[PDB]
């Protein structure tokens, strides 16, 4: 009768550096990276927990967390303990130990047992905080209880050649995990469906009592790298009962999303592509859906504005997504995504451009196939996208020709 | 030393019907009308109160106030009494008398003395809630105390020809009010500056104890129409000391506003004009200003989206202001202001259009010189602005050719 | 898999006058009456909705609603539409019609169909807002869908002699409702257990569109008094499928409540008793429970204080419940319940006293067996509970000797 | 005309360890210590800022700050940047530098200039976060601008023998500071009033642009201990213009406070004394004042309860201050102060006790002259205050005989 989410706590792992995002994560952890016009990556897992009815949330942070923690303080501020709600931001710090850094994803939870236990949740839902996806976690909770698993593991069903970069679960007829392989060159297929493999999402459901004991087990073992994927879960698949949960069974698709949507935006190319795809006529991700909404930190913002329309300049956007507090003054935008606060000035042009909040585009600048970091001021007349060798020397250039542009790159600029 | 706003309470008169806005105010009071892709009209006086440091606000409502009350409840919800802050919504209702109607603007304060006296504010700032303007009321409060006035009245300095439509204050050299005239055919000129007259704003500062006594006198006087403008102030200019405060002295102008901005948007033409002027290259009102911000009710909204770009259709906006959650799909917008939630569809065209929230524009519709009421669905292929005779039969058409369009008029439609 | 409350809207009927509470409800509807030391009666149903997972709430108000509506505005302010939550305060007002009065409890929902249908909830949970009880509405929802009922009705299982004051449901062996009788002299018994009758709590679960259809037909029938209990529900038991849900199956009992707790505090004796019973060593209602908490409007308040300990005066409380911001200065309290803000002064005595917020007790006053209304100032030396004849002349005195004391009564006082 | 607080930012130094409070500050910094029944010490400076109209606040933390940060996050959560309000929590950490420690109170501001400069406040109000006092900083701001000072320093006026423990300002006839001495053996007296000296409160007003340069200068000086009182202020007194502001000129006294109140609660005795003094008939600090309120983090909490009244046990409090959610079950309290959540059980007695939140007193325990730390569980039958030598072996006992009791101390216990 009662939904199990009433008795669950979501615990989000948000310490991931995202080192392949290069300068995009030099000053902020990957869960803090802006995505899709407004939110940050972490808001997706957070919103999944909220919309699934989980109203105790803990977030473990580590690497470069000041921007992430400030976002969480200001955006996720509406939980009240009187209502059996809680939002705990849990950085590694001189608190219960000297340390100041978590030893691994397991240690991220283990060090905060004294926070969890007063709440006495029946269940723990462990979440990667660095992916973009919508999912109703009540489904996994139900499967976990009914299957008697020690751990239920969220898995994507992917073509085996795509699984070579994931931690892959090897399952039997009834989706019980026989073995776990980190990045198999030839991923094991699903029995009776070997064109596909189950790739771990880093979503784990436990009974709290079991998890605490296993965290304590783990923390005593010197063999352990203190990691869910490499230590906790492999021990259980061997000695206990681990079961896979398939993302397709619990993904929340809107009427305007043709397939289950999950993205890890792990490379500059992948991050550019996921954002720019939102400019499509029929985008894979429906950012206009209100049935499974993404909460985030947002301020009252004025509308977007388009000015100038003469023989020489026209401020206008085609095949583009433009946020509030954007003033497109005499600037031509095509196939671009603009976050809030952008100022694009006369005779400039943006094409195939992902523009993070509060960027300024100087008069006459022309930028194609770029990601412009938050707050960058683009000098008047800067050309990007016309000279690959010049662009690669000045900026971080992808082999597929995307330039990531940061303020530090701009400050160094000559010819 | 201490600012006088700490000891003031703002009391906003928000019962105004705005009869000349015709069907724009059929189901909402004038202070509830949307303005500027920014806020509702009432939010300007409320934000002026807030930014001036007044932490006690009351709002008297009357004519058709459901939409207005719900906006106040949801938008103006962050005052806490334990911080000596209060926000009181005061509709005429069976709480102290049967009535269910306020007899006038003086009565709207008078019936609520039992709300005011427990707060014991030293000063009352009585405000009209149906005008768009920015003003720092600390200045009026200083002038009032130092002048020793019984009432201090905010006044616009305007050419006398334009003053024929206002309550007009006749003053001596000291800016003390020696007479008041309701709509003078020949407005009294300011001494030494005869080309201008002081036109009342309906902004009044009193010592609370004095006002409470003047309201009690007024509730007894059978010759009184129970109106601040026509009863309270004239009695004081007669028997006490009334002093005029000029708008230009305390108007808050941003660096991008060439002159003090005040608008009463009292007619459809004036409402259309003030909104459409926000699409100018250098607008009179700076809605991007952050130094004197306008607080309002706002939700997390997705960005605006423009799609399609081929031989036959292109979704794009030129010389226009576009709010979030607008999808401009194959539609051409020019010199238009769109509030949130608009959906404009393929081959439609808007020009010189003020489009309130959640309007839908059907394919192939072409509309020029229009105000479209909140939530209207414009039928595919509807043409407005081509045939004044037909437009005037179907719609509320001003002499200058603005068509106000409501869903009730759409529902009646044929050829 | 997904809880049904996600898809439900709770709709609280809060127009009740509670006329048998006499002067306690002369300026406030019954759901606004204070109960238990802090909350108001309406907060119980509201908190049940919230704790059950229902995040769309409507509250219909009518009789003397200013205090109620201010309570809802300031207390129930944390719902956000972006999260698919809503809290709508729905007074009878000149809005969709002139009226200024709901024709009945069915009409209170019918008039507001235009507010419900934009939310399109799958289920409606219609609640009476004038009872004190705790209940998980997910159980009723499941029974309602699983049974295929047209309406599921919440029912107290009570001894038949106690059911003569209730509207009683006659059921068959499957708890299907075969008849409904308003206040039967000899209430029909439950089959196979005739010592008990099922007494209607005025809680009704419907499929939304079935209810919209029953509401519309009811508004059309001139036979109808426009009432859930005597119009909607009788027709369904006759023409459709009405099923009873027993309170015991879904009451939320803390470990410290020996039985399911339900109270209608319909009379001054019952209100006094239910409150004073909280001073017991083992109270029937556990106001210290945090597993099913009651949300309300609460301000930051200083602690309670006890002053003076000498020959002739000692401020102290025995067998009593004392809220914050109470200063017990030389006053003896025994078996009393004090809401916040009380000032009891030297040489006064309270026994068997229910004391609503911000009451003042003057020096030397002695009061026994009383309910003291919000904000009453008790004159120095007043004696209540000594002389029944004099007490009944001065105050509202019950047959059993409880005096309800209002400020209007105090104002009239001599000897 | 315009108050100066509109353009100030308050910056609270809250990294103080409070070493002399011993185990009371072993797991929290001094600003996080509970005081007076509800608030925490830091809430006084924060409330002074808020009530003075300062809407931008920064709080620098360092030593053991988890509890403090969580308090700030949950309690001080109502500032919105759109209203030009801001509340920044600034712990030393990896962000702008590796360090993760502040080199001193000046470096606590210096490391965060990049947070300050975007706001561009005209004035900085630097505050000590570890003192209990009320003060209207608009007075100090007015004095600063009008005097032309480089730094205006808040100062207590105390008898000279008392000043020997303070940093003392030597002034001339016009309250200009001519020397500064750290703990003078013989404190320089006030000219014309040699019985008194000016003791620095560690409150400093600057022009922001001045301060930013003085900090940059300080961050270059290798002879600098990076301290406001030790390096910044003496430098200015020497080469610039430092002016003293006397606390009596801007202290906020309620009508029930016989003198300006300031306490630093630096020792266990001083902490115990300031709290127990609140049980007085006429307390020096008025915690019931509403004119200058102290905001803090508070939850909805049930009332206090007193039970049992027979010949062997009576739950009651005399000359005591008792917070909500305290159940006094057969326990006798006298001259004690209880924070929320205490459970005192049958036959126990508390005298002269300061009892922090959520303490449980076991049956038959008898405790006199104690501070009991947050959450301590006192064993049944424990006796404290009877045997000085035993009490000092078990607990932290002051020379004056106050025992500080923590759970670690209880956990060691036998006889």
GROMACS .gro file of C-alpha atoms in nm, chain A residues 15-281:
model
  267
   15UNK     CA    1   3.256   1.450  -0.622
   16UNK     CA    2   3.336   1.357  -0.982
   17UNK     CA    3   3.595   1.583  -1.145
   18UNK     CA    4   3.496   1.534  -1.508
   19UNK     CA    5   3.861   1.564  -1.605
   20UNK     CA    6   3.788   1.495  -1.975
   21UNK     CA    7   3.580   1.816  -1.982
   22UNK     CA    8   3.921   1.990  -1.949
   23UNK     CA    9   3.894   2.360  -1.866
   24UNK     CA   10   3.514   2.336  -1.829
   25UNK     CA   11   3.578   2.166  -1.492
   26UNK     CA   12   3.902   2.333  -1.384
   27UNK     CA   13   3.712   2.549  -1.131
   28UNK     CA   14   3.397   2.340  -1.075
   29UNK     CA   15   3.305   1.975  -1.034
   30UNK     CA   16   3.119   1.807  -1.317
   31UNK     CA   17   2.782   1.795  -1.132
   32UNK     CA   18   2.800   2.177  -1.119
   33UNK     CA   19   2.835   2.218  -1.496
   34UNK     CA   20   2.546   2.404  -1.659
   35UNK     CA   21   2.329   2.208  -1.897
   36UNK     CA   22   2.043   2.260  -2.134
   37UNK     CA   23   1.975   2.631  -2.089
   38UNK     CA   24   1.929   2.671  -1.714
   39UNK     CA   25   1.985   2.381  -1.476
   40UNK     CA   26   2.305   2.214  -1.366
   41UNK     CA   27   2.378   1.844  -1.426
   42UNK     CA   28   2.318   1.755  -1.060
   43UNK     CA   29   1.964   1.893  -1.072
   44UNK     CA   30   1.856   1.592  -1.276
   45UNK     CA   31   1.930   1.326  -1.014
   46UNK     CA   32   1.807   1.566  -0.746
   47UNK     CA   33   1.481   1.625  -0.935
   48UNK     CA   34   1.439   1.252  -0.995
   49UNK     CA   35   1.455   1.191  -0.620
   50UNK     CA   36   1.206   1.471  -0.547
   51UNK     CA   37   0.959   1.367  -0.818
   52UNK     CA   38   0.986   1.000  -0.708
   53UNK     CA   39   0.869   1.105  -0.358
   54UNK     CA   40   1.208   1.078  -0.177
   55UNK     CA   41   1.227   1.375   0.059
   56UNK     CA   42   1.555   1.300   0.239
   57UNK     CA   43   1.851   1.382   0.017
   58UNK     CA   44   2.223   1.383   0.099
   59UNK     CA   45   2.488   1.514  -0.140
   60UNK     CA   46   2.853   1.415  -0.096
   61UNK     CA   47   3.100   1.663  -0.252
   62UNK     CA   48   3.476   1.674  -0.280
   63UNK     CA   49   3.663   1.821  -0.579
   64UNK     CA   50   3.619   2.200  -0.634
   65UNK     CA   51   3.283   2.225  -0.460
   66UNK     CA   52   3.227   2.592  -0.375
   67UNK     CA   53   3.014   2.664  -0.680
   68UNK     CA   54   2.827   2.336  -0.640
   69UNK     CA   55   2.764   2.390  -0.269
   70UNK     CA   56   2.642   2.749  -0.322
   71UNK     CA   57   2.405   2.624  -0.594
   72UNK     CA   58   2.269   2.359  -0.356
   73UNK     CA   59   2.231   2.607  -0.066
   74UNK     CA   60   2.038   2.856  -0.281
   75UNK     CA   61   1.839   2.622  -0.503
   76UNK     CA   62   1.754   2.320  -0.286
   77UNK     CA   63   1.637   2.511   0.020
   78UNK     CA   64   1.271   2.414   0.060
   79UNK     CA   65   1.299   2.092   0.271
   80UNK     CA   66   1.181   2.124   0.633
   81UNK     CA   67   1.271   1.867   0.906
   82UNK     CA   68   0.928   1.917   1.066
   83UNK     CA   69   0.786   1.764   0.750
   84UNK     CA   70   1.029   1.465   0.764
   85UNK     CA   71   1.227   1.625   0.480
   86UNK     CA   72   1.597   1.691   0.480
   87UNK     CA   73   1.865   1.812   0.241
   88UNK     CA   74   2.219   1.748   0.371
   89UNK     CA   75   2.524   1.889   0.188
   90UNK     CA   76   2.818   1.669   0.297
   91UNK     CA   77   3.166   1.787   0.188
   92UNK     CA   78   3.482   1.614   0.297
   93UNK     CA   79   3.610   1.834   0.582
   94UNK     CA   80   3.773   1.848   0.927
   95UNK     CA   81   3.453   1.733   1.099
   96UNK     CA   82   3.451   1.365   1.199
   97UNK     CA   83   3.815   1.322   1.089
   98UNK     CA   84   4.116   1.521   0.969
   99UNK     CA   85   4.115   1.374   0.615
  100UNK     CA   86   3.956   1.659   0.410
  101UNK     CA   87   3.915   1.416   0.115
  102UNK     CA   88   3.691   1.109   0.076
  103UNK     CA   89   3.880   0.785   0.007
  104UNK     CA   90   3.624   0.669  -0.248
  105UNK     CA   91   3.254   0.662  -0.324
  106UNK     CA   92   3.191   0.411  -0.047
  107UNK     CA   93   3.386   0.625   0.199
  108UNK     CA   94   3.171   0.919   0.085
  109UNK     CA   95   2.873   0.741   0.244
  110UNK     CA   96   3.059   0.567   0.527
  111UNK     CA   97   3.194   0.889   0.675
  112UNK     CA   98   2.835   1.023   0.698
  113UNK     CA   99   2.673   0.724   0.870
  114UNK     CA  100   2.617   0.945   1.176
  115UNK     CA  101   2.403   1.174   0.956
  116UNK     CA  102   2.200   0.893   0.797
  117UNK     CA  103   2.130   0.687   1.109
  118UNK     CA  104   1.925   0.952   1.301
  119UNK     CA  105   1.689   0.951   1.002
  120UNK     CA  106   1.664   0.571   1.004
  121UNK     CA  107   1.548   0.538   0.641
  122UNK     CA  108   1.447   0.187   0.542
  123UNK     CA  109   1.624   0.222   0.207
  124UNK     CA  110   1.919   0.403   0.049
  125UNK     CA  111   1.914   0.508  -0.317
  126UNK     CA  112   2.274   0.582  -0.422
  127UNK     CA  113   2.293   0.818  -0.722
  128UNK     CA  114   2.563   0.934  -0.960
  129UNK     CA  115   2.529   1.311  -0.966
  130UNK     CA  116   2.694   1.363  -1.311
  131UNK     CA  117   2.439   1.228  -1.562
  132UNK     CA  118   2.137   1.379  -1.739
  133UNK     CA  119   1.832   1.149  -1.728
  134UNK     CA  120   1.480   1.125  -1.586
  135UNK     CA  121   1.383   0.820  -1.379
  136UNK     CA  122   1.115   0.727  -1.126
  137UNK     CA  123   1.303   0.553  -0.846
  138UNK     CA  124   0.987   0.401  -0.693
  139UNK     CA  125   1.014   0.129  -0.961
  140UNK     CA  126   1.362   0.024  -0.849
  141UNK     CA  127   1.260   0.033  -0.483
  142UNK     CA  128   0.967  -0.204  -0.557
  143UNK     CA  129   1.187  -0.440  -0.758
  144UNK     CA  130   1.448  -0.437  -0.482
  145UNK     CA  131   1.207  -0.532  -0.203
  146UNK     CA  132   1.023  -0.796  -0.406
  147UNK     CA  133   1.338  -0.959  -0.544
  148UNK     CA  134   1.506  -0.987  -0.203
  149UNK     CA  135   1.828  -0.859  -0.358
  150UNK     CA  136   2.107  -0.731  -0.138
  151UNK     CA  137   2.158  -0.464  -0.404
  152UNK     CA  138   1.957  -0.364  -0.713
  153UNK     CA  139   2.169  -0.188  -0.975
  154UNK     CA  140   2.038   0.053  -1.236
  155UNK     CA  141   2.157  -0.053  -1.584
  156UNK     CA  142   2.125   0.086  -1.937
  157UNK     CA  143   2.053  -0.162  -2.216
  158UNK     CA  144   2.307  -0.065  -2.482
  159UNK     CA  145   2.455  -0.222  -2.797
  160UNK     CA  146   2.752  -0.428  -2.682
  161UNK     CA  147   3.002  -0.220  -2.881
  162UNK     CA  148   2.880   0.088  -2.695
  163UNK     CA  149   2.923  -0.092  -2.361
  164UNK     CA  150   3.305  -0.116  -2.388
  165UNK     CA  151   3.336   0.211  -2.195
  166UNK     CA  152   3.101   0.118  -1.909
  167UNK     CA  153   3.114  -0.106  -1.609
  168UNK     CA  154   2.919  -0.398  -1.751
  169UNK     CA  155   2.690  -0.633  -1.558
  170UNK     CA  156   2.682  -0.997  -1.670
  171UNK     CA  157   2.335  -1.136  -1.593
  172UNK     CA  158   2.147  -1.463  -1.619
  173UNK     CA  159   1.795  -1.553  -1.734
  174UNK     CA  160   1.626  -1.361  -1.446
  175UNK     CA  161   1.852  -1.051  -1.455
  176UNK     CA  162   2.050  -1.160  -1.149
  177UNK     CA  163   2.407  -1.038  -1.180
  178UNK     CA  164   2.654  -1.325  -1.222
  179UNK     CA  165   2.962  -1.104  -1.272
  180UNK     CA  166   3.078  -0.745  -1.319
  181UNK     CA  167   3.340  -0.631  -1.571
  182UNK     CA  168   3.502  -0.287  -1.586
  183UNK     CA  169   3.520  -0.176  -1.951
  184UNK     CA  170   3.522  -0.516  -2.132
  185UNK     CA  171   3.670  -0.511  -2.480
  186UNK     CA  172   3.403  -0.764  -2.583
  187UNK     CA  173   3.117  -0.701  -2.341
  188UNK     CA  174   2.913  -1.003  -2.235
  189UNK     CA  175   2.570  -0.997  -2.389
  190UNK     CA  176   2.234  -1.036  -2.219
  191UNK     CA  177   2.128  -1.405  -2.234
  192UNK     CA  178   1.883  -1.447  -2.519
  193UNK     CA  179   1.977  -1.099  -2.646
  194UNK     CA  180   2.352  -1.082  -2.708
  195UNK     CA  181   2.330  -0.778  -2.931
  196UNK     CA  182   2.301  -0.577  -2.606
  197UNK     CA  183   2.477  -0.553  -2.270
  198UNK     CA  184   2.369  -0.405  -1.936
  199UNK     CA  185   2.586  -0.102  -1.852
  200UNK     CA  186   2.596   0.022  -1.490
  201UNK     CA  187   2.443   0.364  -1.429
  202UNK     CA  188   2.603   0.384  -1.085
  203UNK     CA  189   2.254   0.375  -0.932
  204UNK     CA  190   2.233   0.134  -0.637
  205UNK     CA  191   1.945   0.054  -0.406
  206UNK     CA  192   2.003  -0.110  -0.068
  207UNK     CA  193   1.826  -0.176   0.254
  208UNK     CA  194   1.992   0.076   0.486
  209UNK     CA  195   2.071  -0.185   0.751
  210UNK     CA  196   2.254  -0.402   0.498
  211UNK     CA  197   2.436  -0.105   0.344
  212UNK     CA  198   2.565   0.026   0.676
  213UNK     CA  199   2.702  -0.319   0.759
  214UNK     CA  200   2.864  -0.347   0.417
  215UNK     CA  201   3.013   0.000   0.446
  216UNK     CA  202   3.155  -0.098   0.783
  217UNK     CA  203   3.281  -0.425   0.631
  218UNK     CA  204   3.442  -0.227   0.347
  219UNK     CA  205   3.599   0.034   0.577
  220UNK     CA  206   3.774  -0.242   0.773
  221UNK     CA  207   3.916  -0.420   0.468
  222UNK     CA  208   4.262  -0.295   0.360
  223UNK     CA  209   4.220  -0.471   0.021
  224UNK     CA  210   3.943  -0.220  -0.059
  225UNK     CA  211   3.972   0.084  -0.285
  226UNK     CA  212   3.663   0.214  -0.097
  227UNK     CA  213   3.458   0.229  -0.416
  228UNK     CA  214   3.100   0.115  -0.479
  229UNK     CA  215   3.163  -0.013  -0.830
  230UNK     CA  216   3.496  -0.185  -0.760
  231UNK     CA  217   3.451  -0.305  -0.400
  232UNK     CA  218   3.099  -0.298  -0.249
  233UNK     CA  219   2.908  -0.430  -0.552
  234UNK     CA  220   3.163  -0.696  -0.666
  235UNK     CA  221   3.165  -0.843  -0.314
  236UNK     CA  222   2.785  -0.870  -0.322
  237UNK     CA  223   2.758  -1.019  -0.672
  238UNK     CA  224   2.997  -1.291  -0.549
  239UNK     CA  225   2.877  -1.358  -0.194
  240UNK     CA  226   2.516  -1.233  -0.208
  241UNK     CA  227   2.230  -1.138  -0.438
  242UNK     CA  228   2.277  -0.852  -0.687
  243UNK     CA  229   2.000  -0.791  -0.944
  244UNK     CA  230   1.995  -0.556  -1.244
  245UNK     CA  231   1.724  -0.295  -1.299
  246UNK     CA  232   1.687  -0.182  -1.659
  247UNK     CA  233   1.662   0.192  -1.720
  248UNK     CA  234   1.389   0.141  -1.981
  249UNK     CA  235   1.153   0.002  -1.717
  250UNK     CA  236   1.165   0.319  -1.506
  251UNK     CA  237   1.273   0.605  -1.732
  252UNK     CA  238   1.028   0.893  -1.744
  253UNK     CA  239   0.965   0.976  -2.110
  254UNK     CA  240   0.749   1.269  -2.212
  255UNK     CA  241   0.511   1.236  -2.506
  256UNK     CA  242   0.771   1.427  -2.712
  257UNK     CA  243   1.074   1.204  -2.637
  258UNK     CA  244   1.104   0.918  -2.887
  259UNK     CA  245   1.338   0.705  -2.670
  260UNK     CA  246   1.472   0.687  -2.313
  261UNK     CA  247   1.712   0.976  -2.266
  262UNK     CA  248   2.040   0.941  -2.079
  263UNK     CA  249   2.360   1.137  -2.141
  264UNK     CA  250   2.681   1.153  -1.945
  265UNK     CA  251   2.825   1.450  -2.142
  266UNK     CA  252   3.172   1.321  -2.053
  267UNK     CA  253   3.372   1.488  -2.333
  268UNK     CA  254   3.365   1.841  -2.474
  269UNK     CA  255   3.219   1.691  -2.793
  270UNK     CA  256   2.949   1.507  -2.602
  271UNK     CA  257   2.868   1.816  -2.396
  272UNK     CA  258   2.848   2.040  -2.701
  273UNK     CA  259   2.635   1.788  -2.887
  274UNK     CA  260   2.378   1.727  -2.611
  275UNK     CA  261   2.322   2.099  -2.566
  276UNK     CA  262   2.316   2.187  -2.935
  277UNK     CA  263   2.069   1.906  -3.004
  278UNK     CA  264   1.815   2.098  -2.801
  279UNK     CA  265   1.796   2.342  -3.094
  280UNK     CA  266   1.641   2.064  -3.312
  281UNK     CA  267   1.282   2.089  -3.434
   0.00000   0.00000   0.00000
